[PDB]
């Protein structure tokens, strides 16, 4: 298990770590989060108490570097930093872990939720969507736009998700206009999976990362991307059987984790009704259909 220590916590803030959250009071003796499970990506996130504007946070993997958080009072936010040298870092942290002022990552032993939400997510692929090569961790916030949103404005501060557009020449082969528009299999299997993603694991990783950025930051472009990637599969008549069974598992845990009270803003009624009741795969997502009907029957 690894630790993200804090220099201090000078402003009152709600801190998220993966699907957990806790409040820190202005100048409370908080020195970070400890017992973070090795083996998974993680996200540490923030929403200031005095200004719920800009949710922001950092995607990291403790296997890649020694990471701490210090509040920068000029830019007004908690920043992730990297200590390159292990001995210096180990000396500062053990002090605080002896003085007991860290929240323990509260992993229940039965619980596979975080693994189920990040099964296909890798730091290396995160760092390609979020471009800032000099850090091993990736900053994301509420207001960051995606490359597709920019085409429809700073490109350095953007989320470089794979663009999906059903009415684009990339999606439609000349001579196959009706075929490719009504059955997205070409676009899914040849353009996206064979061409861009190389395999379904990479496609699912981006889908999972988009969902998590929508849920944890309220990032609108991320929500758009998550739904586009779902609709592309459901709108394809020809999908490998293992991909459909894994999608059902991925979506089930996403719907299970979504706060009930954010359903009006995180779920697109049109896409979900199309996917579950009209699409080619309307009968291929049994676990997701069952949780959706029992948890959010209003949306349907």
């Amino acid at each position: 298990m690894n630790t993200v220590p804090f220099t201090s916590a000078p402003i009152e803030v709600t801190i998220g770590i993966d699907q957990y959250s806790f409040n820190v009071k202005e100048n409370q003796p908080f020195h970070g989060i400890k017992d973070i499970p090795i083996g998974h990506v993680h996200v540490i996130h923030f929403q200031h108490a005095d200004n719920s504007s800009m949710r922001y946070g950092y995607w990291f993997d403790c296997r890649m570097g020694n990471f701490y958080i210090q509040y920068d009072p000029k830019d007004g936010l908690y920043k992730m930093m990297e200590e390159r040298d292990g001995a210096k870092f180990e000396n500062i942290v053990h002090n605080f872990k002896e003085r007991q002022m860290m929240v323990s990552y509260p992993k229940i032993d039965e619980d596979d939720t975080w693994y189920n939400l990040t099964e296909f997510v890798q730091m290396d692929k995160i760092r390609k969507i979020v471009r800032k090569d000099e850090n091993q961790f990736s900053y994301v916030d509420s207001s960051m736009t995606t490359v597709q949103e920019n085409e429809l404005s700073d490109p350095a501060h953007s989320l470089n998700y794979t663009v999906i557009n059903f009415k684009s020449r990339e999606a439609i082969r000349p001579g196959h206009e009706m075929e490719d528009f009504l059955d997205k299999s070409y676009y899914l299997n040849t353009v996206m999976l064979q061409g861009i993603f190389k395999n379904s694991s990479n496609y699912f990783g981006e889908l999972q990362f988009a969902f998590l950025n929508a849920m944890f930051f309220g990032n609108y472009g991320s929500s758009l991307q998550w739904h586009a990637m779902i609709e592309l599969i459901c709108s394809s008549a020809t999908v490998p059987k293992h991909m459909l069974d894994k999608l059902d598992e991925i979506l089930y845990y996403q719907i299970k984790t979504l706060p009930e009270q954010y359903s009006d803003i995180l779920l697109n009624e049109r896409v979900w009704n199309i996917c579950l009741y009209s699409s080619f795969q309307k009968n291929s997502l049994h676990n997701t259909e069952k949780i959706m009907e029992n948890k959010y029957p209003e949306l349907l």
Binding site: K167, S168, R169, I172, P174, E177, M178, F181
Partner: protein, 237 residues
């Protein structure tokens, strides 16, 4: 976006545009079978593609052979229409290609948009106007070429005959829509109005009779009376 009664003069400006009406593409008769079931029989159809400024009508005749062995024909018909309009645009010299294509039915928007992705500068638009172009097959010379066709064919007409020598395209379109609305509402009475007088004939190279300016006023009045008459009969007014 959509085209309506506010921006109606736009139809007659100098930006090339085309209306596309797909109503008469897929046409059938419905009949009982020997076993007492019901069957359809397709008949020849057409795409109605019109430049409202010039009167140029690109009538693409849809021969029943294009449906053979195909499924979901009502859906296919929209995509076949889009395919054929796309092919027409590509066949026209650049300086003749439309800047806008207005579809009379919103179901044609996605099919035409997808077939025209190669032409991102051609706007594909719906319209709030209720246009009576489904009645084109009430024009005898158009109906005749469609039903006689034994193979796919494209035929070019001017649907305004020579009217633009004497009237504006705004007035020509208004006359056309009044004539077609009357033919749609009561075809027999409309043709009686148009053909009752043998001293007025249809030139071999025209679709409508050779009415003088004052005679067109009379005919137009009789058409409006027909429409009002049928309205009264329909709603018991």
């Amino acid at each position: 976006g959509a085209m309506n009664s506010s921006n109606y003069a736009e139809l007659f400006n100098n930006d090339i545009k085309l209306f596309v009406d797909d109503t008469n593409v897929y046409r059938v008769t419905v009949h009982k079978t020997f076993e007492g079931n019901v069957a359809t029989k397709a008949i020849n159809g057409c795409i109605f593609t019109l430049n409202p400024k010039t009167g140029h009508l690109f009538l693409k005749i849809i021969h029943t052979s294009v449906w053979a062995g195909q499924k979901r024909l009502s859906q296919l018909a929209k995509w076949k229409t889009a395919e054929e309009v796309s092919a027409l645009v590509r066949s026209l010299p650049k300086e003749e290609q439309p800047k806008q294509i207005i579809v009379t039915r919103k179901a044609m928007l996605d099919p035409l948009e997808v077939h025209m992705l190669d032409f991102p500068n051609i706007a594909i638009r719906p319209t709030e106007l209720r246009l009576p172009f489904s009645a084109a097959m009430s024009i005898d010379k158009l109906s005749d070429v469609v039903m006689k066709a034994t193979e796919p064919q494209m035929v070019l007409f001017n649907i305004y005959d020579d009217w633009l020598d004497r009237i504006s395209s705004y007035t020509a379109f208004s006359r056309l829509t009044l004539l077609l609305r009357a033919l749609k509402t009561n075809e027999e009475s409309a043709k009686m109005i148009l053909l009752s007088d043998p001293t007025i004939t249809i030139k071999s190279y025209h679709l409508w009779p050779s009415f003088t300016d004052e005679q067109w006023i009379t005919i137009e009045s009789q058409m409006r009376d027909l429409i009002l008459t049928e309205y009264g009969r329909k709603y018991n007014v």
